[PDB]
Amino acid sequence: MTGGKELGAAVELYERLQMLSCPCLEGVYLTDPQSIYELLCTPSSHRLDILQWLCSRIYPPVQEQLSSLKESQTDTKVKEIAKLCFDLMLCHFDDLDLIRGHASPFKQISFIGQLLDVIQYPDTISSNVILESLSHSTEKNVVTCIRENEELLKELFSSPHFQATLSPECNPWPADFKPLLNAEESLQKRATQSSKGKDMSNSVEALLEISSSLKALKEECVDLCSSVTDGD
């Protein structure tokens, strides 16, 4: 039940970590969703140094700072990662236990996805632009992004649709369905009284019993299954 969606999302984040070439997976060839979920969701150094690589991919000046911090300074790495993720609008600066791995798995998964999204994919491998002097790259990249954002914001805000996206409503429903859709205080009682994860199971359970009973009756009635079409 439940955790099957947290197991599946751990595989999504793990295959994306391989696509984005995480060196903290070099030789770490897991094929079990439980082991993959535990690598992303349990309190480990392996996971904390993955979170440090994700932080270094998004914001390289943290890589000097976190490599200055030892094994015996890991609970200091945790606070500078949480403080970075707060500055980056991902968690609170005291959200240390999301950074360690004691938070609920869906919160860890949602946090790791919001790191992997910002690590744009290597689609046009521009081989030389990896290590030419960052101190004469960063200000250009800030000005170009400020320009992209001025153009994109000025041309988003020129659209007549630009208040509807910010306040969306939809109605596919024609007149011959609106008596049902107005019957809220009667019909929503049924919609809240269904036990769902039970109801789905008992439906397949009865379908299997009736299929077995129908099979057995046809394996008995074999002579009556003979196509003697000339009955009249």
Partner 1 sequence: MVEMIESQTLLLTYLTIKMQKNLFRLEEKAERNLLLVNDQKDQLQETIHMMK
Partner 2 sequence: MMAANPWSPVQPSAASLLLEKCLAAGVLSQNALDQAQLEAPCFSHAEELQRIT
Partner 3 sequence: VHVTFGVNMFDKPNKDAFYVVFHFLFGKLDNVRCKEVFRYCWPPLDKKRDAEFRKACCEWLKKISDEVGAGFPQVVASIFLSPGGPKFVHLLYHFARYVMLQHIKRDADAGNVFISEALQSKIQDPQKALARNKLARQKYLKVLQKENLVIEEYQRKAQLLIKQIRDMRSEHVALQNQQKLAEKVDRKISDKDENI
Which residues are near partner 1 by CB under 8 A?
A: 89, 142-143, 145-146, 149-150, 153, 165-170, 173, 177, 180-181, 183-184, 187-188, 190-191
- Closest to 15 (Cα-Cα) out of 113, 159, 142: 113
Of 8, 43, 60, 122, the one binding partner 3 by CB under 8 A: 60
| Residue 190 amino acid letter | R
- Phi, psi at residue 134, to the nearest 5°? -55, -35
Distance (Å, whole) CA 114 – CA 180: 40
Q: Is 196 left (phi over 0), alpha (psi -120 to 50) or beta?
A: left
Counting contacts by CB under 8 A, is residue 91 touching partner 3? yes
CB of 97 to partner 1, least distance (A): 25
Per-residue mark of binding to partner 2, 144-183 (x: CB under 8 A): ----x--xx--xx--x-xx-xx--x-----x---------
CB of 174 to partner 3, least distance (A): 7
Counting contacts by CB under 8 A, is residue 2 touching partner 2? no
Distance (Å, whole) CA 83 – CA 76: 11
Counting contacts by CB under 8 A, is residue 4 touching partner 2? no
Contacts with partner 2 in 121-150 (CB under 8 A)? 121, 123, 148
Of 44, 76, 86, 106, the one binding partner 3 by CB under 8 A: 86
Question: Contact at 8 Å (CB) between 7 and 34?
Answer: yes
Q: Which does 183 bind (CB under 5 to 8 A by kind): partner 3, partner 1, partner 2, none?
A: partner 1
Q: Which does 187 bind (CB under 5 to 8 A by kind): partner 1, partner 3, partner 2, none?
A: partner 1
Question: Contact at 8 Å (CB) between 133 and 37?
Answer: no
By the 10 Å C-beta count (0-12 exposed, 13-18 middle, 19+ buried), 136 is classed as exposed
Contacts of 86 (CB under 8 A, 6+ apart): 92, 93, 95
Counting contacts by CB under 8 A, is residue 185 touching partner 3? no
**Residue indicated by tokens 């009667």:** 186
Which residues contribute to the site for partner 2 (CB under 8 A)? 117, 120-121, 123, 148, 151-152, 155-156, 159, 161-162, 164-165, 168, 174, 194, 196, 199-200, 203
